[PDB]
Amino acid sequence: SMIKQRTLKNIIRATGVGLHSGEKVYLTLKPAPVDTGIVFSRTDLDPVVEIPARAENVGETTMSTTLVKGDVKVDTVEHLLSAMAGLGIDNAYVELSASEVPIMDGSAGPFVFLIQSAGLQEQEAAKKFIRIKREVSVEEGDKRAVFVPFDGFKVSFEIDFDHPVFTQQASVDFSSTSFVKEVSRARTFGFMRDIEYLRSQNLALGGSVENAIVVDENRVLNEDGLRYEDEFVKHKILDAIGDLYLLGNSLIGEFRGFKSGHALNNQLLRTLIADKDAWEVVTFEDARTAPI
């Protein structure tokens, strides 16, 4: 009854556009061996450049989570890493034909469908977990991000936009609530005045109502509206779960964020890793007694 590492049963292919680059990209997800982790692979380059999805490999953290190795980058990993986390995938190669993961519909839903379509393969090695033993918190200005010990996995998040479209708080316990049903479909979002400024700096080149909630001063411009009453904060949870997967093992504990984002989330990851008294690596001989 040991909790085992998981990979894909089959290879998966998909096509899309990078949210920032607007470049067409071909994505392939491939099974990987035990103790590989998630590894991104720029197959458009010669020689091929591979970047393990790990906190040490994170570059700038402005408008997405970016992996960097020399002057090669992989942009906007957070939603695909979220999907991997949501289905418990430990080992996979992610092949990209360009610098950015495709945005798809703005959510992790297409990725969770692609992975489940491929099927999961249990491997003959114990899954390793990071268990939080001490509260670890980082703050900067009005923003805060925390890990608290918790016998399971759960994410709480609160946002605070002074905007007519604004609930700005949600908490999900992933042992009793489905990531697939409650979080995976939550789409990225953009305010018209940010979008106007990002374009002018050659960012959000791939953005559209097909892949993002577009908000003007008053309302969602998307014809078919929101998927969740609380879609915005549910998307922040989705982002956080992706960033958390850069720890390189699944977490037993609780993440709380207040106005947090990639920059402060990464600060928290680095602070947790640095304080070895605050965590331990653990395995489970028996899924029937385990905290998740």
Ligand SMILES: O=C(NC[C@H]1C[C@@H](NC(=O)[C@@H]2C[C@H](F)CN2)CN1C(=O)C1CC1)c1ccc(C#Cc2ccccc2)s1
């Ligand atoms: O601004 C964006 N994202 C950042 C937002 C979404 C959230 N971040 C995330 O989802 C992270 C970071 C990437 F967006 C994915 N993962 C948190 N957050 C913010 O806090 C904004 C308010 C400062 C945009 C997303 C799509 C845009 C467009 C567009 C567009 C539409 C029509 C035509 C032309 C172009 S702009």
Ligand SMILES: [Zn+2]
């Ligand atoms: Zn996002």
